[PDB]
Write a protein that binds this ligand. Structure first.
Ligand SMILES: CNC(=O)c1cccc([C@@H]2C[C@@H](O)N3c4cc(C)c(C)cc4N(C[C@H](O)[C@H](O)[C@H](O)COP(=O)(O)OP(=O)(O)OC[C@H]4O[C@@H](n5cnc6c(N)ncnc65)[C@H](O)[C@@H]4O)C4=NC(=O)NC(=O)[C@@]423)c1
Lengths: 666, 133
């Protein structure tokens, strides 16, 4: 898309109607004349354009109204309302921009942010640019959260996020112009390789892949056309549904074989009935021949009865000689039909043991994407976010994806090695209680008007609690926490002194010898300048490989790589890092997933702020005090960095609206 | 609205495979049995019709008789008259067989015969005798 229309698209907005959120801030415009709605939309899209076309400098309201033209620039309050809405909700002037207007000398309100992950950092930068006083409490000794980046010498490798999923509508596109990121396209050629060590033949890869895709559609068919979404009073998972599809294909193969051979019998028996007709007829022809022959033995001249008897047997015998010939055509007409049927038999199996092992790789890829075994994904909803997919190639970050959070942190009050243990929220304000991670005896108390929790979902899930809420979180919130899924997914970074793989493939696969280990070291990435390969542990393997030491894991990697490249092209690696995200107490997983029994609505429950009760009974209903953000809180873009970032941008706006007022709704 | 091509899924099918914890292997393992019994039933009858082909060695070539290529005449010698009355007694109204016995008369003058010589050869009575057979 191009024009002002491309700016709406690159900001996840329809150009030609107003969102629910604009309806809320501009209820006059929506309910008003169709022509006024159209003027608004152009002002929005044009302002979005002006920001997108240059996101290294603030877009001031004055600068905005000057590039605008009549009749659009006739109304200055509409323009000032639109620009302020866009500014407030992080559609313009987000990220790292140079400030035309230096920020107010003195601040308003005080916000504590728990976590300096991308979602935390994006809120902190927004709030601080809205004139608030912001402090971030971070348990780690570094920013970035689940954006971790290994650095030693010129070796560089991401242990957390590493992929940017396409710049078509992605806010990371803006961030890329802002922070220099060496973004490198991912070539989607992935050569698979068997446990034997040899490549998969190109005909086989394409069969199995396409069956994988067809199997997925079939589950969708089961889900949306046959309402097969509950079984035995429990919600059906994706993996359940896949088995049931596979079994029905296996069944339908057997049904075809039975129906085939059942034709062979039904003609072998129609033959049998024909041959018993031809025995019992040949034995009549034996007998008439003898009789005709004897009757021919009586010498002429014959009385007429004896002549009749020769001529009669002769007719009778040629008659039976014709039935036997007609039957011998019908015998001929069944013999080739049996040959034809026997030589066009249906398919022997649905999938060979080798086939199902390569299919298991594609299931490991899918378990990778969703960071969980397919027996936990909800069949109905696991893909509820596919409609908001960004356009374009996926990408990697050659220089390390930590460069983004490290950049966002510039200018911000961040307390590292500061672990929150209790969050207290009352009608008059909040106090957050943190210890020092190095020495836990040292205790800190932070008082503030509002808390922005960006605690990972795996932490909020922890029993017994890592963080205590006072008062406890309401049931509607803790139940969403239990229902959602927090997955797991680990990486092995392999640091070599020389490239020994194909430099022209970014990624290649290893097929597992069994289903249970389908995720165990199933895929490898060549994304970096230095000789680094990077290997994934997905599915049920992810949680189990965490009780296995580094050397044993690096062993299995070298083993698998020897079989690919020969036992003498693989050096011992110079540096080795193995991630354990489920073990990490500030993560307790890798990212969220739509569990069976859950749904996208839980993601909206996770985003609703908390309003404490009144201090004095009968005192007026207070302000909301406890706010939530992070990847587990954004329905349409869960479990990603761009989604984390977007959730920070939205809480900053919601908090500012609450504590600075929103003058743009009149 | 419809499953992918090459995918078979039926409301009927899914309940039978999901009805218990083993209903999948159960449904599948009847059909391995139903397949193996039909297979052994094939090799059975494949061997019984093997036997019956051997009982038919040589067909009926020795028992065949050469074709009687005989121009069709029209007059009725007393001989072919008496052959007629005997065929009527053996064949009812199958006038093809009767035209084959006598040889030199076609199926129409057999019909004609049934009527011209009907009184004198007393064909009515002969046919009743044939009916009792
Ligand atoms: C359905 N999924 C897809 O569709 C999808 C689509 C495309 C690509 C991806 C990939 C998958 C992977 O390949 N990669 C990835 C890899 C790993 C290993 C991991 C672990 C993650 C990813 N993420 C996700 C991304 O990493 C994350 O979702 C955001 O980063 C989250 O950020 P945030 O919510 O801020 O949480 P943090 O956890 O960061 O911050 C919290 C802060 O709280 C601190 N803290 C805790 N406790 C306390 C306390 N008590 N006191 C004080 N502080 C405390 C803590 O210390 C931290 O600082 C991926 N996403 C990508 O986009 N690209 C990728 O590349 C991908 C998946």
């Amino acid at each position: 898309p191009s024009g002002v229309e491309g700016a709406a698209f690159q900001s996840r907005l329809p150009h030609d109607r107003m969102t629910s959120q604009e309806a809320a801030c501009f209820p006059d415009i929506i309910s008003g004349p169709q022509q006024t709605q159209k003027v608004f939309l152009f002002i929005r899209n044009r302002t979005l354009q002006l920001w997108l076309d240059n996101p290294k400098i603030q877009l001031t309201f004055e600068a905005t109204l000057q590039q605008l033209e009549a009749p659009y620039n006739s109304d200055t309050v509409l323009v000032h309302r639109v620009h302020s809405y866009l500014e407030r909700h992080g559609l313009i002037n987000f990220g790292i921009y140079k400030r035309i207007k230096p920020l107010p000398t003195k601040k308003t309100g005080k916000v504590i942010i728990i976590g300096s992950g991308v979602s935390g950092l994006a809120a902190a930068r927004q709030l601080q640019s809205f004139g608030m006083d912001v402090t971030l409490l971070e348990a780690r000794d570094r920013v970035g959260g689940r954006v971790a980046t290994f650095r030693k010498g010129n070796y560089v490798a991401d242990l957390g996020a590493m992929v940017v999923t396409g710049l078509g509508g992605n806010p990371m596109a803006v961030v890329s112009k802002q922070v220099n990121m060496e973004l490198a396209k991912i070539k989607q050629k992935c050569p698979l390789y068997e446990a034997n060590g040899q490549a998969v033949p190109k005909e086989k890869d394409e069969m199995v892949e396409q069956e994988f895709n067809r199997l997925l559609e079939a589950t969708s068919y089961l889900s949306h056309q046959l309402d097969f979404n509950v079984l035995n009073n429990k919600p059906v998972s994706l993996g359940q549904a896949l088995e049931v599809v596979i079994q029905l294909q296996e069944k339908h193969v057997k049904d075809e074989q039975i129906e085939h051979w059942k034709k062979i019998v039904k003609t072998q028996e129609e033959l049998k009935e024909l041959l018993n007709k031809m025995v019992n007829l040949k034995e009549k022809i034996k007998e008439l021949h003898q009789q005709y022959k004897e009757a021919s033995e009586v010498k002429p001249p014959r009385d007429i009865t004896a002549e009749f008897l020769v001529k009669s047997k002769h007719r009778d015998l040629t008659a039976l000689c014709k039935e036997y010939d007609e039957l011998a055509e019908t015998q001929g007409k069944l013999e080739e039909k049996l040959q034809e049927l026997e030589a066009n038999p249906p398919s022997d199996v649905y999938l060979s043991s080798r086939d199902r092992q390569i299919l298991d790789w594609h299931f490991a890829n899918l378990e990778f994407a969703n960071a969980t075994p397919l027996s936990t994904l909800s069949l109905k909803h696991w893909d509820q976010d596919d409609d908001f997919e960004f356009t374009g190639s996926h990408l990697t970050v050659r220089n390390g994806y930590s460069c983004v959070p490290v950049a966002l942190a510039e200018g911000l009050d961040i307390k590292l090695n500061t672990a929150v243990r209790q969050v207290r929220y009352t009608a008059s304000g909040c106090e957050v209680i943190a210890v020092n991670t190095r020495s836990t005896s040292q205790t800190f108390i932070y008082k503030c008007d509002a808390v922005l929790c960006t605690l990972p979902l795996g932490v909020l899930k922890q029993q017994p609690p890592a963080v205590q809420f006072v008062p406890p979180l309401p049931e509607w919130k803790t139940s969403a926490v239990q229902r959602m899924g927090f997955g797991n997914l680990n990486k092995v970074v392999l640091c070599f002194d020389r490239v020994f793989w194909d430099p022209s493939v970014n990624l290649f696969g290893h097929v597992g010898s069994t289903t249970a280990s389908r995720g165990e070291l199933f895929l490898f990435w060549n994304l970096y300048k230095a000789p680094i390969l990077l290997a994934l542990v997905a599915g049920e393997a992810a949680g189990i490989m965490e009780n296995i030491s580094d050397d044993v894991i690096v062993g299995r990697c070298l083993a698998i790589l020897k079989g690919i490249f020969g036992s003498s092209a693989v050096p011992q690696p110079k540096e080795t890092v193995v991630s354990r995200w489920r073990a990490d107490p500030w993560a307790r997983g890798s990212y969220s997933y739509v569990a069976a029994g859950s749904s996208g609505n839980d993601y909206d429950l996770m985003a609703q702020p908390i309003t404490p009760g009144p201090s004095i009974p009968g005192a007026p209903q207070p302000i909301p005090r406890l706010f939530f953000a992070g990847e587990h809180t954004i329905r349409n873009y869960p479990a990603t960095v761009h989604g984390a970032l977007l959730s920070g941008l939205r809480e900053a706006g919601r908090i500012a609206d609450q504590f600075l007022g929103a003058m743009y709704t009149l | 609205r419809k499953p992918p091509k090459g995918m078979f899924l039926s409301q009927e099918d899914v309940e039978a495979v999901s009805a218990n914890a083993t209903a999948a292997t159960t449904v599948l393992r009847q059909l391995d049995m139903e397949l193996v019994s039909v297979k052994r039933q094939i090799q059975n009858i494949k061997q019984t019709n093997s036997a019956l082909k051997e009982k038919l060695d040589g067909g009926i070539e020795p028992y065949r008789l050469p074709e009687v290529i005989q121009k069709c005449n029209a007059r009725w010698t007393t001989e072919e008259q008496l052959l007629a009355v005997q065929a009527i007694r053996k064949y009812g109204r199958d006038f093809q067989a009767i035209s084959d016995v006598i040889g030199n008369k076609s199926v129409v003058q057999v019909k004609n015969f049934f009527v011209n010589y009907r009184r004198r050869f007393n064909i009515d009575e002969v046919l009743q005798e044939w009916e009792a057979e």
